Amino acid sequence: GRRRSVQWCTVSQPEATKCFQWQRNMRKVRGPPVSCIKRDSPIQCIQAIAENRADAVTLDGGFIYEAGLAPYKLRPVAAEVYGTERQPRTHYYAVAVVKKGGSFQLNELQGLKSCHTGLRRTAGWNVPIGTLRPFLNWTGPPEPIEAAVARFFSASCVPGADKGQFPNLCRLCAGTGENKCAFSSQEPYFSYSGAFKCLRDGAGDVAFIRESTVFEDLSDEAERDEYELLCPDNTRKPVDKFKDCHLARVPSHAVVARSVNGKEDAIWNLLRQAQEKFGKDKSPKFQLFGSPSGQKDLLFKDSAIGFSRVPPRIDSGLYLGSGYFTAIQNLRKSEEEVAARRARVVWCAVGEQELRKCNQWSGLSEGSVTCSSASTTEDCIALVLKGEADAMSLDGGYVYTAGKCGLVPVLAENYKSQQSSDPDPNCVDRPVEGYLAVAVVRRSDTSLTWNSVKGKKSCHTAVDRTAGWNIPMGLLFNQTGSCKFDEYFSQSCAPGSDPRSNLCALCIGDEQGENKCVPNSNERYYGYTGAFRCLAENAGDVAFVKDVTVLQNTDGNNNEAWAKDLKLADFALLCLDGKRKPVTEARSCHLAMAPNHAVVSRMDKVERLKQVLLHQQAKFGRNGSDCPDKFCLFQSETKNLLFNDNTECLARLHGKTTYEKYLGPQYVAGITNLKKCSTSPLLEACEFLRK
Ligand SMILES: [Fe+3]
Numbered sequence: 001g002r003r004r005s006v007q008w009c010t011v012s013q014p015e016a017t018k019c020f021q022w023q024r025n026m027r028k029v030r031g032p033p034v035s036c037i038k039r040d041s042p043i044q045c046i047q048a049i050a051e052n053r054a055d056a057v058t059l060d061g062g063f064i065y066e067a068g069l070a071p072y073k074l075r076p077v078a079a080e081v082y083g084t085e086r087q088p089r090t091h092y093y094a095v096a097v098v099k100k101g102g103s104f105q106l107n108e109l110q111g112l113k114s115c116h117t118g119l120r121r122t123a124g125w126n127v128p129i130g131t132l133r134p135f136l137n138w139t140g141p142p143e144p145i146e147a148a149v150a151r152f153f154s155a156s157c158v159p160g161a162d163k164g165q166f167p168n169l170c171r172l173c174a175g176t177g178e179n180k181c182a183f184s185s186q187e188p189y190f191s192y193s194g195a196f197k198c199l200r201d202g203a204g205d206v207a208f209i210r211e212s213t214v215f216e217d218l219s220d221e222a223e224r225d226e227y228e229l230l231c232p233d234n235t236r237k238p239v240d241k242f243k244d245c246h247l248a249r250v251p252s253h254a255v256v257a258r259s260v261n262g263k264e265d266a267i268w269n270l271l272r273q274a275q276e277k278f279g280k281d282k283s284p285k286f287q288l289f290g291s292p293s294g295q296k297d298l299l300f301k302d303s304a305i306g307f308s309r310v311p312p313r314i315d316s317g318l319y320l321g322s323g324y325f326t327a328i329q330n331l332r333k334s335e336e337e338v339a340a341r342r343a344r345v346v347w348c349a350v351g352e353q354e355l356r357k358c359n360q361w362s363g364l365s366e367g368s369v370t371c372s373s374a375s376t377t378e379d380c381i382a383l384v385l386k387g388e389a390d391a392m393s394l395d396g397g398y399v400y401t402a403g404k405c406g407l408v409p410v411l412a413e414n415y416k417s418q419q420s421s422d423p424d425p426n427c428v429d430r431p432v433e434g435y436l437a438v439a440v441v442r443r444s445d446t447s448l449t450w451n452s453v454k455g456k457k458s459c460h461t462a463v464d465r466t467a468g469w470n471i472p473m474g475l476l477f478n479q480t481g482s483c484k485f486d487e488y489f490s491q492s493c494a495p496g497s498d499p500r501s502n503l504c505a506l507c508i509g510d511e512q513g514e515n516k517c518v519p520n521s522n523e524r525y526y527g528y529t530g531a532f533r534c535l536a537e538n539a540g541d542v543a544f545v546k547d548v549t550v551l552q553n554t555d556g557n558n559n560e561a562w563a564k565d566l567k568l569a570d571f572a573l574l575c576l577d578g579k580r581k582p583v584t585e586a587r588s589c590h591l592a593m594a595p596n597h598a599v600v601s602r603m604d605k606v607e608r609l610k611q612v613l614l615h616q617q618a619k620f621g622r623n624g625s626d627c628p629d630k631f632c633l634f635q636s637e638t639k640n641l642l643f644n645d646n647t648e649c650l651a652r653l654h655g656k657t658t659y660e661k662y663l664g665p666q667y668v669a670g671i672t673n674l675k676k677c678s679t680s681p682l683l684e685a686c687e688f689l690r691k
């Protein structure tokens with residue numbers, strides 16, 4: 001009984017009052033119901049919801065962070081939309097408003113008077129204090145950052161600060177008696193409009209608010225030109241040029257709920273209806289996004305125009321975005337701890353074997369490389385978005401997903417070039433030449449042809465990888481038009497698929513027989529090597545891999561049991577012309593050319609990453625000083641851990657620094673078409689964030 005009634009948590013009396021009106025109008029029109037829980041602060045509401053005593057609460061970005069921590073672990077389910085109907089946006093701008101007359105710039109605020117929306121709020125605290133840090137001369141913890149702020153500004157109103165401990169921080173506040181410097185409407189200088197009033201009254205010199213506040217609060221535009229903006233370029237521009245004069249671009253306030261049984265569906269149901277019925281000018285009897293005269297921003301932001309549903313994959317960290325998320329965390333760190341983390345590279349391992357190899361690397365990196373890890377490649381990408389990881393080597397298929405998530409290629413895996421040169425001295429600058437995606441079959445099955453491969457059993461490296469999937473399936477899809485990929489072959493092993501599907505049938509999990517179809521090295525049939533073993537052991541009739549995979553796994557080149565006797569002659573390639581050729585003629589018999597695997601990272605990490613990786617490969621690379629004496633980066637024994645084992649070196653992108661430029665027009669077009677049939681949650685997640 002999850003759709004009984006949505007319990008909305010309020011943090012004040014008139015909030016409870018408006019909520020009660022909401023409740024009657026919803027019943028007043030036979031809509032999805034809602035009940036009103038009373039608390040006295042955002043924190044109490046987060047707690048309430050966490051322990052199943054409330055369902056939903058709207059929070060500022062700064063309290064979205066708080067709410068997502070343990071033990072609470074809540075998540076944004078719906079985002080407030082701002083702007084207009086023509087140009088809606090799920091973000092706003094933290095700005096610094098001043099009076100037109102003074103002549104100080106943002107970098108000249110020492111000894112001045114500041115008005116803040118509230119402690120720990122996005123526009124009122126996290127952004128401005130983050131921006132002003134270099135000027136703060138804060139020695140770091142354990143001295144609380146507040147103390148440095150109390151010394152920087154001669155006096156401010158920061159609602160919710162400990163006036164006893166940080167009295168300067170509560171000085172300008174206007175609250176009366178116990179309501180002085182309170183985190184609520186009782187304090188007239190609380191929130192966006194309060195902080196703007198704090199400035200208007202002349203109490204403060206600067207107000208840290210959002211871009212709209214000045215337009216919501218001043219009707220006549222003559223008064224609006226009495227105010228100015230401080231730009232981070234230490235210039236002053238009019239209040240209409242916020243797009244070119246802001247301290248940060250930040251994610252809209254959002255409705256949070258539990259991550260488990262939070263009644264997300266019921267919640268979104270109520271919201272959509274509430275919005276349609278009581279949205280902007282839908283009915284005068286009730287206004288979802290309006291507050292009574294002396295009130296502002298009750299339940300939701302006034303002048304919001306609706307909500308947008310937050311895709312399921314997104315948690316508090318993903319929602320906040322890498323910039324803002326790590327900026328908040330940084331506020332409790334010293335400038336040396338922050339600089340150390342900026343200098344180190346956190347790799348993301350996929351599965352315990354990669355982590356294992358990663359740690360070995362870590363121990364020998366002299367503080368430059370550390371390790372993170374997850375069980376899928378998509379979870380790792382997510383970690384990179386959240387900043388708890390920095391980099392990894394990816395197949396071209398995942399470079400697409402990474403690129404649509406904002407990530408970028410930095411270096412590429414360079415493989416034994418087309419018999420061009422010796423162990424190349426200039427490997428690092430040799431442009432990549434791609435590798436060959438092929439279809440391998442057993443020599444004995446003399447009947448198997450490209451034309452007759454449909455309906456047979458298939459072995460793939462994984463879903464969404466270049467050679468194992470995007471290229472074969474793209475070819476098959478371009479014939480028929482069916483998005484029913486699990487109907488192309490009788491059975492397959494295609495890790496990353498639905499375990500109950502026929503695409504998982506041939507998979508065999510780990511030695512114990514667990515982790516079947518898991519898209520990581522624990523699955524014995526995962527990857528280049530695994531998809532070939534899938535064929536050698538006669539599980540499928542065709543393995544979609546690259547040609548060197550066969551070379552590397554036969555003729556005693558792999559002394560592992562399943563392969564120790566495999567001869568290159570026992571296998572053949574399928575040509576698209578319907579012919580079949582020996583593996584050695586792959587250049588004249590392959591499905592397509594695949595772009596090299598590449599290391600991807602956040603834009604902020606590119607330069608550091610490049611320097612570290614170059615250095616590290618000079619030590620542990622192919623001709624690394626410490627390889628093979630100590631450690632080799634590109635070795636693992638046909639297991640392709642972290643990097644392909646046949647990597648010659650990591651090479652320069654030669655200007656192809658975007659996924660589109662790196663993957664190529666045709667390939668990107670190919671995957672985009674494939675993706676009409678189905679996209680991942682990560683992909684849905686990132687499209688929401690990109691908007
Ligand atoms: Fe805000």
Ligand SMILES: [Fe+3]
Nearest residue numbers: 395396466467
């Ligand atoms: Fe690949």
